[PDB]
Symmetry: D2
Subunit: 226 residues, 4 copies
């Protein structure tokens, strides 16, 4: 009963065991803070078009995987309003460059849970029955219930999308891969603060016969999704 | 306070740099990753890229040993029974002719107890230095690294070893997510692809030091308290 | 600069480093589901007076530690409304005995986040600046951000209270102790579904020169708290 | 194609999905330090017959599960020779009662990796293909690769044996249960420093319709093992 997605450096998933019941899409940190005007990334002066580029491709993948009954997971990087989960170094770095986590901005308190800027963008909003992971780090496994959730659902395969490619997306992929999950990175469904770093994070997956998994794109996924 | 000249900010961020709260970690300087006959060699990558950091790590190691800093070493590898080896990881390595567990000139590839898997003689651990044996790229995943760091009350980590974009970068991300303050020494790491090495380094610097800061062996040795 | 609380089998904390900045009270799972009429524990037919007994002693410890600026942590065992974090075995066991997690009861859906029965009882309600851990298991470290929070605050010492003694309280103490935290169990500030199991969980702490930490009571803590 | 083991409070595993490929025996900390003369437990003056009693029953369960191709896991509590993984409180407690971890005794350095006293006893020694977990705490999940190993092998069911019942065995069971694993405690295959604490740890499993899993014995397991 095998099915593959055309991918680089190998057809994904490795063993062809691609089904709705054992496969999840994860949409990482598609929040106003990371891709919208007035947010954290905007405050740092990075080019929002790099991180907005993946919105429509993720939209297409999301629609297709919803229609076929695949597990859908969303993440939000953010902190408790009391900032108890905010490392001192992380906070200081963000303040030094004028984008202080917890400080007020046009979208509310930066990367603070419950604030408008922190929420997932309307274009990729979750619907009921889709798990949201609230995380205080870049990696989606660190200090969350993601592993527990994945194991209860018996998820083996993860399709990664979202932003930023080299930070949250890459870290989540590394975490997942280290724990035995089989991951596909959709290159047109991520974007970064630096386009070269985006391309490099993608190439890093491919080395050593697919060290972190494999790489494809939104069109190829939609085409071959069972 | 004490600082090391680093990019994008002088490290550590708060100047709290002492022997008692700072560790060097030497990641995966094993024959499998940088020596002839090992895993990386089997894949056809250029061993000089991964051998380049040996002498600079040696200098940092000697200095930090002399000043009583905590020293940690890692080894990526698997139990002889391969119970800790994900099926996908194994399959990928077999597909490209460098199968984990399969026999080669240095023994079974990335298998604990085999010659190829051990730390190279140049950077061998001495008594009192903790070795982390890990089944993944990240040094926190499925190990006691966090426990060890917390018992010693380590706040600052200086990262060296190979490969820059795989084990080193993953370990840095893990550490940083948990609140550790990390310095990557750019001349003390190397990768399978030199551009990926440079990119992993540049990734640290974004957003005012998203994963920590970056320096080099000479600058560290010169300013180490 | 050392301070100790009279405890068994050794004066706590072991090294006398007892300060507001490095010490937290944790109040475990003082929810209607575990000690109130109509909840999970009531449904199973256990004697609510055993689990209600610790309310006033915890109240006294809470008031004292708040007044002296100690870190205060609360926990709630519970599940996401979609039950993504609910193991199949856990759910099945609870249904078999007529107290099914997620099923409707007089206080709402049993052990389901957002429901009246699941919330912390009014007597021990959190105030702003006190961290609440929402956990899908008995142990407060499993699949939560508790460790991350404790480490950012540099907490070394934990004073444990709440219910039930042999389940969530004991599991949390074991987790904390394994990771190097120095724990004090307040015996009059916990209670269980079986009084002998309560006493036994307490005695287990004391073996081997304090294998899990040490044991005291609410009066002794209040009297000697710096 | 369901199979059950006669157990209390419910026939185990809960869903009858009992197979060699998804079930592991874990033999916890059957080391000279915990059950042999000259070791840690002996130094504390506890009665070695309590902790030796389970040896022959574990032997029978081990032989049967080996013969039927079940996954076999062993654990060893212990510390690196440099004691980097040894919490200061844990060490201090052990020194206070004259059984200091790392200190020299008749079996070598107490609970120190590489020492004779620390190794698994010859009667229950591992054979090739059987995973050994080296752990610095009582819980077998804390700071180890146990979860990773279990997930790669797709283990759902765990049969727990070893010592001590109320410390390492119970903590491991709680950890496993919190993460969704289905656990059976074999009551004649464990023993403790206090026989009443042993019985209490066992009874704790049974509350609330099997809060931590279920309880059986070596004979019942061997007789019904598929
Ligand atoms: Ca060499
Ligand atoms: Ca930290
Ligand atoms: Ca600690």
């Amino acid at each position: 009963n095998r099915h593959f997605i055309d991918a680089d450096p190998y057809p994904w998933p490795y063993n062809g065991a691609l089904r709705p019941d054992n496969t999840a899409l994860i949409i990482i940190d598609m929040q106003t803070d990371f891709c919208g005007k007035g947010g954290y990334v905007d405050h740092m002066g990075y080019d929002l078009s790099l991180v907005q580029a993946p919105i429509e491709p993720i939209k297409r993948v999301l629609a297709a995987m919803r229609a076929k009954g695949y597990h859908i997971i969303h993440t939000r990087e953010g902190h408790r309003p009391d900032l108890a989960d905010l490392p001192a170094n992380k906070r200081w770095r963000s303040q030094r460059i004028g984008a202080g986590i917890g400080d007020p901005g046009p979208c509310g308190r930066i990367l603070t849970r419950g604030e408008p800027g922190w929420d997932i963008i309307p274009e990729l909003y979750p619907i009921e029955g889709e798990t949201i992971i609230d995380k205080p780090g870049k990696g989606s496994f660190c200090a969350t219930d993601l592993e527990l959730v994945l194991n209860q659902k018996r998820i083996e395969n993860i399709i990664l999308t979202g932003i930023t490619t080299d930070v949250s997306v890459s870290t989540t992929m590394r975490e997942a891969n280290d724990r035995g999950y089989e991951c596909l990175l959709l290159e047109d469904c991520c974007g970064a603060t630096d386009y070269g770093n985006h391309l490099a994070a993608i190439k890093m997956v491919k080395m050593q016969g697919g060290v972190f998994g494999s790489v494809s794109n939104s069109a190829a996924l939609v085409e071959a999704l069972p």
